[PDB]
Amino acid sequence: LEQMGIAAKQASYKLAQLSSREKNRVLEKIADELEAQSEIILNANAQDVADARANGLSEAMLDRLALTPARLKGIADDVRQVCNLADPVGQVIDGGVLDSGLRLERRRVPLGVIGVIYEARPNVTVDVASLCLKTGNAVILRGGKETCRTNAATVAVIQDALKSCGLPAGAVQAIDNPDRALVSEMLRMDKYIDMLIPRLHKLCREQSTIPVITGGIGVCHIYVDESVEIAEALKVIVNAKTQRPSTCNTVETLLVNKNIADSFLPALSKQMAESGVTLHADAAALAQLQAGPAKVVAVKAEEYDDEFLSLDLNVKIVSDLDDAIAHIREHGTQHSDAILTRDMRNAQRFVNEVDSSAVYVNASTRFTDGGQFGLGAEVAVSTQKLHARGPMGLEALTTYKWIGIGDYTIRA
Amino acid sequence: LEQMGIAAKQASYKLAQLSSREKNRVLEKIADELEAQSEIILNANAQDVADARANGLSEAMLDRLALTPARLKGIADDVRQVCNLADPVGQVIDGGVLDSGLRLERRRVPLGVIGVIYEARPNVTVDVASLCLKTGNAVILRGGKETCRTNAATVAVIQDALKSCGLPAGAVQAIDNPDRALVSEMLRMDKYIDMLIPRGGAGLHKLCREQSTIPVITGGIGVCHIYVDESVEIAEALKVIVNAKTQRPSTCNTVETLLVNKNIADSFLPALSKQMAESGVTLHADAAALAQLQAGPAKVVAVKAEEYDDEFLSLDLNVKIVSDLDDAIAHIREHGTQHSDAILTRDMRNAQRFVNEVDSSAVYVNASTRFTDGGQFGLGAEVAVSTQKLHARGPMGLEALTTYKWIGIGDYTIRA
Numbered sequence: 001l002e003q004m005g006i007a008a009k010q011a012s013y014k015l016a017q018l019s020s021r022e023k024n025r026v027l028e029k030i031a032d033e034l035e036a037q038s039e040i041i042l043n044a045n046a047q048d049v050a051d052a053r054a055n056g057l058s059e060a061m062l063d064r065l066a067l068t069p070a071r072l073k074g075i076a077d078d079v080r081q082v083c084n085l086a087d088p089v090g091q092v093i094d095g096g097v098l099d100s101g102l103r104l105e106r107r108r109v110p111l112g113v114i115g116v117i118y119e120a121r122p123n124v125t126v127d128v129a130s131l132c133l134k135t136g137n138a139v140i141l142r143g144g145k146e147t148c149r150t151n152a153a154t155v156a157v158i159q160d161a162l163k164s165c166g167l168p169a170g171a172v173q174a175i176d177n178p179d180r181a182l183v184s185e186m187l188r189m190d191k192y193i194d195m196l197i198p199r200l201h202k203l204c205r206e207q208s209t210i211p212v213i214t215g216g217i218g219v220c221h222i223y224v225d226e227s228v229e230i231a232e233a234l235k236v237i238v239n240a241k242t243q244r245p246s247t248c249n250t251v252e253t254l255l256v257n258k259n260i261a262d263s264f265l266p267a268l269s270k271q272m273a274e275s276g277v278t279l280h281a282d283a284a285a286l287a288q289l290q291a292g293p294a295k296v297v298a299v300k301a302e303e304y305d306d307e308f309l310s311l312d313l314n315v316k317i318v319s320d321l322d323d324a325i326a327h328i329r330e331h332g333t334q335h336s337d338a339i340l341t342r343d344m345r346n347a348q349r350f351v352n353e354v355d356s357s358a359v360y361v362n363a364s365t366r367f368t369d370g371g372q373f374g375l376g377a378e379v380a381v382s383t384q385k386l387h388a389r390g391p392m393g394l395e396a397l398t399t400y401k402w403i404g405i406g407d408y409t410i411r412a
Numbered sequence: 413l414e415q416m417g418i419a420a421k422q423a424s425y426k427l428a429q430l431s432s433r434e435k436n437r438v439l440e441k442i443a444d445e446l447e448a449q450s451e452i453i454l455n456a457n458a459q460d461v462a463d464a465r466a467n468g469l470s471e472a473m474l475d476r477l478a479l480t481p482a483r484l485k486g487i488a489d490d491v492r493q494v495c496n497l498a499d500p501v502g503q504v505i506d507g508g509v510l511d512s513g514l515r516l517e518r519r520r521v522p523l524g525v526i527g528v529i530y531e532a533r534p535n536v537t538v539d540v541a542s543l544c545l546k547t548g549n550a551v552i553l554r555g556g557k558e559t560c561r562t563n564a565a566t567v568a569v570i571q572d573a574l575k576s577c578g579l580p581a582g583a584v585q586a587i588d589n590p591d592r593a594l595v596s597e598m599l600r601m602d603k604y605i606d607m608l609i610p611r612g613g614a615g616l617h618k619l620c621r622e623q624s625t626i627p628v629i630t631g632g633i634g635v636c637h638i639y640v641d642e643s644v645e646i647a648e649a650l651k652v653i654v655n656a657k658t659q660r661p662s663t664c665n666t667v668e669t670l671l672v673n674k675n676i677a678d679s680f681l682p683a684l685s686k687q688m689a690e691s692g693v694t695l696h697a698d699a700a701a702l703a704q705l706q707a708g709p710a711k712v713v714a715v716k717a718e719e720y721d722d723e724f725l726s727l728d729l730n731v732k733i734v735s736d737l738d739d740a741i742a743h744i745r746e747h748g749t750q751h752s753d754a755i756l757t758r759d760m761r762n763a764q765r766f767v768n769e770v771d772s773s774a775v776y777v778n779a780s781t782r783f784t785d786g787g788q789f790g791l792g793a794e795v796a797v798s799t800q801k802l803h804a805r806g807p808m809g810l811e812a813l814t815t816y817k818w819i820g821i822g823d824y825t826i827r828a
């Protein structure tokens with residue numbers, strides 16, 4: 001795989017000097033060619049879907065790994081959308097004249113070669129390819145074993161487009177082979193790859209030597225204060241849970257203040273049965289919600305630290321804001337945390353004392369997305385504290401360097 | 413070390429919840445105490461320098477270890493200047509209003525617990541402690557073998573100041589034992605320290621990166637190349653080179669390879685040989701420049717292959733003749749450590765191309781490579797020079813020790 005890495009390095013060197021207009025024309029060209037050769041992609045997708053169905057995968061997984069012609073049309077659409085974004089490469093961050101007559105400035109530059117790992121997601125292939133092409137970063141894709149044929153066809157089409165536009169063919173590469181030893185090798189190219197996006201986390205945590213920007217699992221907690229409007233809080237909770245539960249930013253643990261719980265829990269159950277989410281409630285929550293129409297069961301200790309990714313929820317009663325903060329600190333994964341309240345001091349304390357990647361006040365937790373934050377598109381959501389945090393846009397894939405201009409200046 | 417880490421975390425929470433006035437008070441008291449207790453620090457440093465010289469320490473190494481009253485006043489002034497800096501905690505990076513009506517913004521926050529493993533140097537401890545206190549982080553320091561008594565005195569003074577100010581005693585901690593097993597255990601303890609800063613040579617960096625479970629901002633070694641173009645002033649280039657090399661050769665931002673164009677090599681090489689002979693710099697010249705530098709007064713010797721990829725840390729320089737700007741760029745890319753690179757030229761196009769095509773942490777045009785320092789770059793003080801690409805790069809100031817957090821405010825806003 002050394003040859004592939006050296007090809008990616010050369011491609012990054014060539015791409016770092018490109019112009020914004022050339023990148024936009026390239027993006028439009030690849031979108032056009034993807035639209036043109038839709039039938040070839042669809043045939044491979046149908047074959048892969050038939051193979052997966054023969055393997056016994058569920059209907060939901062089969063739909064997820066499938067691709068309709070409408071889906072590829074949408075892929076062309078968001079590629080064209082990223083074509084219209086603002087290029088952050090070369091932009092000046094800050095600068096000034098020093099005391100010794102030296103003019104300093106900081107300039108944004110491409111991060112180099114980016115290796116991303118995913119599984120059973122066909123659209124993310126084209127999405128990450130376009131996003132790295134816009135920034136001028138050579139990308140190495142880890143296509144899933146399930147959809148190897150579709151990913152191979154897509155990367156072949158993109159490479160054909162790049163050759164048509166004259167760009168080096170090594171800008172975008174993919175490893176179709178599903179061998180785990182190759183995965184370890186990719187996890188152990190420090191000198192070549194400069195940054196890794198794992199979209200599984202434990203494996204790279206143990207083995208990786210390249211700096212890793214993790215995505216991580218997300219258990220988002222919502223705290224309900226004693227003074228709040230019942231109907232609006234219920235609507236916010238329903239939007240946070242009912243709409244697309246499979247997303248990693250959905251709420252999982254709901255914290256209800258002790259004082260308001262007596263009134264909140266009955267209406268919560270009344271709306272909850274209509275929404276139809278199972279309530280893994282605590283002991284006191286069980287006692288209060290037993291009369292409720294919504295189905296409710298006891299909660300186990302390990303359920304608080306794991307995301308259901310389904311129509312399930314956890315109900316816990318806390319004494320006050322300090323108890324909720326302690327619980328969030330102990331069990332939270334630092335992904336998203338929101339508070340519904342009508343007190344200014346409580347909101348200020350919650351904002352100051354919580355160290356999540358995104359804190360909301362009287363808002364849903366479903367806004368932790370690249371599109372909602374106005375970043376155009378995102379590659380992943382980072383829960384670490386280094387480099388980018390939260391949704392990662394274009395500027396998250398660029399580093400900076402210092403440039404100093406003088407006239408034979410010497411330090412004194 | 414588990415109790416050390418838990419104390420660090422407990423102190424870090426309160427430090428992140430503190431205000432700017434208290435941190436400024438702590439820093440001012442630290443500076444005043446350091447000025448008051450100069451005699452003990454000076455005596456300890458003198459004893460340590462004498463002991464190290466008794467073990468045949470290098471002159472540059474001794475100079476790095478040596479601390480004068482002027483240097484103590486300088487570190488006190490640096491502490492005060494850091495105290496005068498604006499607090500980067502709570503500052504807003506950007507914000508706006510979304511379509512859905514969600515007022516969004518980004519705010520700076522402390523990183524948490526910071527571990528640092530530095531070389532044998534007395535001032536780096538004070539600067540690291542001051543920066544971590546100003547930023548609201550808790551710091552665990554592991555010093556070198558030589559700086560034992562000076563580091564003990566400095567950490568005692570800092571802890572006394574923290575106790576006097578009423579801040580939690582776990583904010584700043586240091587490990588006295590020079591055993592490397594403790595270093596390995598610090599490396600393996602992840603859930604407690606949030607970021608590790610190693611300062612040293614290749615061996616330490618390799619050791620941590622082999623057994624690291626924490627994010628690491630490598631200090632890295634410095635091989636700084638200076639490229640001389642065809643059209644350039646000989647005297648000014650010689651002065652810049654002399655300033656880059658002669659002044660403090662023990663640093664990590666000192667030029668180690670001199671790239672000379674063929675066209676200018678006819679005239680630049682002789683005069684250079686005269687200049688370095690004044691400074692006693694030994695010239696490790698390539699085969700092409702060996703004939704030209706043979707008649708020069710300065711001592712000249714052939715250069716081995718591995719010399720291009722290692723730091724001399726002495727009064728030595730590598731002289732190589734390159735064909736053009738592209739050859740120099742290729743050589744810098746192949747053998748450079750991405751620390752600092754400078755070009756001396758009188759052509760605009762060459763300077764622009766060199767700035768564009770060189771992906772180093774610092775690029776200079778008609779300037780020395782000795783400017784790659786936290787103080788010179790306008791920052792109050794530096795914790796380390798980062799040669800990596802993730803998070804901070806180049807000198808690391810106050811903003812390099814902070815992360816950010818998104819905050820959104822709305823009136824029960826719902827995503828559609």
Ligand SMILES: NC(=O)c1ccc[n+]([C@@H]2O[C@H](COP(=O)([O-])OP(=O)(O)OC[C@H]3O[C@@H](n4cnc5c(N)ncnc54)[C@H](OP(=O)(O)O)[C@@H]3O)[C@@H](O)[C@H]2O)c1
Nearest residue numbers: 530531532556557595612613616631632633634664796797
């Ligand atoms: N990048 C920067 O910002 C920066 C700044 C200053 C200096 N430097 C670099 O500093 C280097 C010279 O430093 P130095 O003279 O102190 O020598 P060094 O060998 O680079 O120092 C290594 C440091 O780590 C410790 N160490 C060494 N081997 C270790 C091991 N196997 N496991 C754990 N710890 C280990 C050393 O103390 P023990 O030997 O007692 O373990 C010392 O504190 C230069 O190459 C220069 O580039 C870089």
